[model samples]
Target: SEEPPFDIRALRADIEDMISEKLELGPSLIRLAWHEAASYDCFKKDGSPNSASMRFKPECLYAGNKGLDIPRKALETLKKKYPQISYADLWVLAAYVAIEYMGGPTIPFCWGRVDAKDGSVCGPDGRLPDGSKTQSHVREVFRRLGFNDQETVALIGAHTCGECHIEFSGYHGPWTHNKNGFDNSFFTQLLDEDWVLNPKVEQMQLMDRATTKLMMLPSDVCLLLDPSYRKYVELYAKDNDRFNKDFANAFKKLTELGTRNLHKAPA
Candidate 1:
C-alpha cells in the first residue's frame, strides 16, 4: 500500500517544523482564526472556517477584529510554502499547531476548506468580547450558540493558551506565565492568588505574594464567584492532570462546535 512519488507524512513533518518556529505567534494567531470566522455569523449556512472570508474588504476592517493582521501575515508565509493549501485550511491548521505547541491536545486536522471569491462580509460588530463586560453578558453570547456552562468555561480556558493583547482585547496579560507552554496554570492562579478589586476595571487582580506578578480576567474571576461554574473551576484548579484532560476535551468540543462529524483525533 506504500506509494513512492508522494510522501505525505514527510510533507506534514516539514510543515510542522516551519510552523514550530512561529509558536510565539499563537496569541494573535487564535485572534486571527476567531476574527476570520466571526465575519460569518449564523445568518447564512456558509459563513464558517469552511470558507476563508476575511480576505476581502468589508470583513477585513471589521471592528470586532481590531488587531489580528499579524497572524494573517504569519499564515501568508505558510500559504506561500504550500501553495496548494487554501486560506481556510491554513488558518485552522495554524490554530491546531498553536494548540499542540502550547501543550494542549492534538486537534484533528482537516483540509477541505476552500477560499471564497465572494467573501463572507462582516456581521454586526461586538461579536468578540469586551474586557469590561460582566459575566452575564459573556454567558449570553455563548448561550446564543446553545453552549452549556461547561462549554462556556472550556472556551475561556482556551484563552489560557493565548493572551489578551491591550490592542486586541484591551486586557494586556497572560493567563499563565509560560504563555508558550499550554497547561492549567490559569486555573491555579485563579484559585491561589490574593486578589483585590482592580483600580482600572474592578474585576479583581490575582497578585503574587508581595509583588504585582499576575492577574485574571473578569470572566476568570466569575468562576470563583458563580456557583454554577465553580465546580469545574475547583476541579481544574486543584488537580493538574484533571485540569489538562478535561480542558482538552472541553476545548476541542468548543472549537469544533458547529462543524459536521468532527470526531476525536490523535493527541
Candidate 2:
C-alpha cells in the first residue's frame, strides 16, 4: 500500500516565512531550538515541549530558555495569526523550517501535536546543558537520555550550526565561519587548524589558533580526543552530506524521545 502524502505546503510556506522573519540570525534560532526542545526530560515526568512547557508561570522564565524568549515571543505573534498550531509543534517546526531556510537538510514535517493548556505544561528545572561545565558533565546529561559517545559528538556538530554566548550559554564564540549555514566548516576547520590550548579558559580547554574567533566548549573540544567519538568527527570532516544525513536522523530521534509510545505523527 502507498503511504499518505504530507502535502502541507501552505502550512510550510506560512511557517517558513514567519519563522525566517521572526528569527534574526539563523544560528541563534538553531541554538534556540536545541535549548527549547531539549527542555523535555520525560524521566522526570514534567511533560515535554509537546506541551510548550517553557511558556507558563515558573517554566516560562527558566534560565535554560534564557535568550530564547525573543524567538518565542515572535512565535507567539505567529500563533496569533495561525491559532491552530500548538506552540510545541510550532517551535520545533519553526526550527525545522529555520534549518531548511538556512540551507540545511529537509526534516520530515508532521502534524497532530495539539496545543496543551497551562495545567498540562511544566518540566522540572535543570534538564538542559550547562555549557559552563565540562565534557564529563555534558556526557552524563546526554547519556541519561540514552545517547552514546558518537551520537553525542554528532549532536554537538549541530553546534557547528550555531554560536555560544557566555551570556546565553556561558560558552562563548562561534566555532565556524559559516555560522548561519549548516555545513562542514566546523569539521574542516577543526582538522586544518593548529589548536593551541586557550590559557584564558582556566578549565584546561583549547582553541584553534588560526582563528581565535572560534571557540569550543570543553564538551566540544573533547569529541575529537575521545577514541569513541573521533571516528564520527572524522566522517563529518570528510563529508558534509553524510553529516547532515546523520544529524537529521539523530535530532529527529532526540526530539521525539520518551513520547514514542504515545506520540503520533501523520504517516
Candidate 3:
C-alpha cells in the first residue's frame, strides 16, 4: 500500500496558522466545508464532494454562500503544496479541522474524495437551505439530503459557531454569545431566551438576549415548533457531551454522503 504523504497534525498546524491570522475565519471555514458537502444529491448520482464542484459557478456564486471565497482561497495555498490531496477532501478536511481548532470535537476525517474537473456536474440550486424557509421546508431539504430529525437537529447545532451577515444570508448577528466556540449554547439560548421576531428582515431573526445587536435565523428558531425536533433540542441544550457526540457523528455522515471508495484515516 502507498503511504500517505502528509500528516494530520501538520495539516492542522498549517490550517491553524492560516486561520489564526483572521479573527472570524473559523466559522466561515466550517461553512465552506458544509456548503461544499451539502451539494450532494443521492437521487442524481452527482454533486458529491468526489469532485469539488463548488470550484465552479452556481455553487461558487450561490448567494447564501457569500464570504466563502476566503476559506477556499486559504485552502488553495495548501492544495498547491499538497498536490496529491483533492480539493473535495481538502475543503471538508479544512472544515473538520477548523471545528477542532475552534475548540469543538475531534470530527473524524477521511480521504479519497476526487475533485470535479468542471461545473457540468454541479447540483441544481435549492439543495441548500436559506434563512427564509419554514420548519417544514428545513425538514424537506435535509430529508432529501438523507438526514432525519435527530441528525437534522444535531447538525443544526453548528449554529453555535457562526453568525450571519445581512449582505450574505439577508440576516445579521450570531446565534449564541460565544460565536467562535462550538457548544450547546445555541439550543440553550433558543429555549431559555425571551425571543421576539425582528421586523426589518423578510425572515425572522431572534433579537439579542441583552440587546438588538445580535440575532438568530428563523430557520434556527423554528426547531422549537416541531415536537420531534424540539425533543433533541431540549436534550442537547441540557447535555453538551451528548450534543458533541451526536454532532460528530452527524457531521461525519454529512461529509461522507455521495462519497465512494473512501479510505479511512487511522484515528
Candidate 4:
C-alpha cells in the first residue's frame, strides 16, 4: 500500500507524541521557533530560521542560543521520518504545535524555507534580545524585527510559559506558576507583584514577594516599567481573549519576518 500524505496536522501529532509526556520541552520548542525566526535583520537581509541555519557551527554556538540542541535533536528524529519537510518548516511547525498544546493561541505557519549548507552563512550574533537589558534596548531589538510596542508586549506574553536556566541566560525559574501552559498570568504577576531585584546576580531579576521561586528578567519586567509598553500588559492581564488574538498576530509576523516571495495567504 502507498504511504499517507505528510500533512501539518500529522506532523503536529508526531511532535506531540515525542514531546507531550515531557511537558517541559514545550518552552524549548517555542524558543527554538523564536530563536530561529528571531535571527531576521530587516536592514541587512541577514539571519533566517527559514534556512535552519542554527544547525551549523557559529549560530548554534551563540551564547544566547544555549540549550537549543535539545529541540534540534528532537527535530532531527522527525527529519528522518519526513525527509520531505525542510528544517525551517519543521521548526516553525513544532513551535505552533508547542504553543497550542500548551494552551496558547493557534499561531499560523507556512513552509518553503531552503536549508543553508553551513554555519558560514548563518546570521551574526546579537540579533536576539538580551534578558539583561533595559526597556530601550528591548524596544530597539523588537523594532529591528519590525514589531511595535504593543506587539512586543503581546509577544512577551510567551514568557507566561517558559523559565530561564542559570546554565543558559544566567537567570533561572519561570515567570508564572503555569510554566507549561500559556495565559496572561505573566502580565498579571508583573503588575500585581512587588518585584525586588536580586543583587546576587549581575543581571536584574525581580523576585516575587512570597518566594523567589518565580522570577522575572529585566526584559520581562520592562513592560510594566515603561508606560507605553505597560498599556498592553495591563490590557492583556485583564482580557485573555484579546491577549490570545494579539499574540497570534504578532507571532505570525515574527515567524515570517525575512521571507522574500510571499503572498497574503498562509504558506
Candidate 5:
C-alpha cells in the first residue's frame, strides 16, 4: 500500500511514554518483537515479521511463544490509538522503543510490513531454539538464519534486559543483575559469575552461586561453555560500546528477515 497513514514519531513517543511509566513492559515488548523476528527460517523462506505471524496459530502455539500474548495484546491499545500502523510494524517498533527507553542503543528500524489475513501465510512450527539445549542446538537455529557466531552472541545479549518467568518459558530469574536495562553485563555475567544449577529449575537453568539472584537458561551458559562462542562473549564483556553497536546491527538485521519494501521513516 506504500502507506502508513500516521506520524511514526508520535506513535513512538506515545509508545515511549507507555513503556516509561510501566517499566516491566520493556522486556515483554522486546521479547514480543524478538519472537516475531526469530521465527524466520531462511531455507523455508517463511514466517518473517512481515505478516505478524505470531499473532496466529502454528506460530503462536509454538513452545517458545508462551506468555508472549501479554505483550502482543498489550500493544493492542496502541493499535487502537494508531490504527494506521500495521501490526507487524507496531510489534517491531515497540521493541525499538523498549530498547531505546531502557538506555540501550537505537537499533535501525523500518516500517512497511503488511499484516496477513490468516496464519496460513505463517511458516511451519518448531523453528525456534529450545533453552535447555547445548551450543550446537543454538548455533544451528541462528546459523540457519544467516547469523554468524558474533552476530549470534550479540543478539543473545538481549538477555541483559529480561527475566525468565516460569509461566513463560518454564525457567526463572534475570540473566543479569540490571534486569530492566540493556547492556554488556550479559556478557560480563556470563564470564565472571559462578553459575550453579537451580534447585527449583534443575538443569533447565543456572543461577549465580554468589547471589542466587540472577539466572541463565542452559542455552545462555552455552556461550561460555563453547570455546568458539566464548571469545565473542569475552569481547563484549570488555567493551560496552562494541556490545551496543554490534547488538544494534544484529537487531536490525533480525527484524529484516524475509521482509520487503521496508523504508526508513524520515525524521
Candidate 6:
C-alpha cells in the first residue's frame, strides 16, 4: 500500500503552532470555519461549504463576514505550504485544531472536501444570523440550518471563543472572559452576569459593566430567556465534559453540511 506524503496530525500540529502565537487568532479561524460551512441551505440544498466558495466574491464580501478575510487568508498561507490538502478541508481542519489548541474538545475531523473554482455556488448573503436578533429570529435561522434547540445551544457555546470587535461588528465585548478558551464559561457567564441594556447602540445588545465590560448578543441572552433553550445552556454550564461532547458532535454535523463524495484520508 502507498502512503500520503504528509500526515493530518502533522498538519494539525503546525496549525497549533501558528495559532499559539496569539489566542485571538484561534477564534477567528473557528469563526471562518463556521461561516464557511454555515452558508448551506438544507431546505433549498443550494449553498454549502462543499465548494470553499467563500474564497471568491459574494460570500467573502458579505457584510456579516467582514474581516473574516484575515482567517481566510491565514488559511490560504497554510494551504500553500500544505499543498496536498483541499481548501475546504483545510478551513474545517484549522477550526478543529484552533479549538483544541484553546483547550476545547478534539473534534472529529474529516478530510475530503474539494475547492470551487469560483463563487457560482455561493447563494446570496443574509443566510447566517446577525448578532442582534430575537430568540424567534435566531430560532428560525438555526432551524433552516437544520439544528434544533439542543444542538444550536451547544454550537452557541463557541461564543466563548471570541470578542465583539467594535470596529467591525459595532458591538464591542467578549461573550465571556478568558475569551480565548472554548468552554461552558459562555453558559456560566450567561447565568451569572447582571446584564444591562447597552445604551446609544443602534440595536439591542446586553453589556455587564462591573469595572470590566463583557457582552452578550441578544441570541446569547435568548438561550436563557427561553426555557427550552435555557435547559441545555444550563445543562452545559453544570457539566464541562457533556458540553465538550455535544459541541464536537454538533460541530461535526455543521461542517459536513452539503459535503459530497468525500475521499478517505488521515483525519
**lDDT (Cα atoms) of all candidates against the true structure:** 0.60, 0.67, 0.81, 0.83, 0.85, 0.83
Task: Show the colliding residue pairs in model 4.
Answer: none
Reference-based lDDT, residue 78, model 6:
80
lDDT tens digits by residue: candidate 6, 1-267: 223344776788788888987668899988888888778778888785546788898788888888898888777778888898888888888898889888999876666677888878787898878887868987888888889999999998999888888777788878887888888899999888788898856666888767447888887898888989999989999999999999999998888888876544544
> Which portions of model 5 show Cα errors greater than 4 Å?
1-4
Whichever of 2 and 3 has more TM-score, that candidate is: 3
In angstroms, the error of model 2 at 113 is 1.6
Question: lDDT tens string, model 5, 1-267?
Answer: 233567787898998888878888998998887788787778777665556888888789988889888888889999999998889899998998899899999876788888877888777677778888989999999988879999999999999987888787778788888888888999999889898888887446788999899998889989998998999999999999999999999888888788888877765
* Higher-scoring candidate on TM-score, 1 or 4: 4
Residue-pair clashes per candidate:
1, 0, 4, 0, 0, 0
Candidate 3 lDDT tens digits, 1-267:
333456656777788888788848889988887888787766665665436788898788887677788888888999888878788888888888788888889986888887888888888877788776769989887887888999999999998987887677777778878898988988998898878777787756778546765577778877988888999999999999999999999999988887787776765
User: Given candidate 5, what's the lDDT at residue 28?
Assistant: 91
Clashes of 1: 1
Worst 10 residues of 2 by lDDT: 1-10
Q: Deviation in angstroms for 10 in model 3?
A: 1.7
Model 5, backbone clash pairs (residues 3+ apart or across chains), number? 0
Order of quality (lDDT): 5, 6, 4, 3, 2, 1
- Clash pairs detected, candidate 5: none
Identify the candidate with maximal TM-score: 5
Model 2, 1-267: lDDT tens digits are: 222223345556776676566444556556665665675554564446545666676766667677777777776766777666667667766777777887778877555554557744666678777765656777777776667776777778876666766675555667887667777667777677777777775544457787777777666666667676778788889988888887787776665554433333442
lDDT of prediction 3? 0.81
Better of 5 and 6 by lDDT: 5
State the lDDT at 220 in candidate 1.
Answer: 73
Task: Kindly report which residue stretches of model 4 are placed more than 4 angstroms away from their true locations once superposed.
Answer: 1-5, 199-202, 260-267
How many backbone clashes are present in model 3?
4
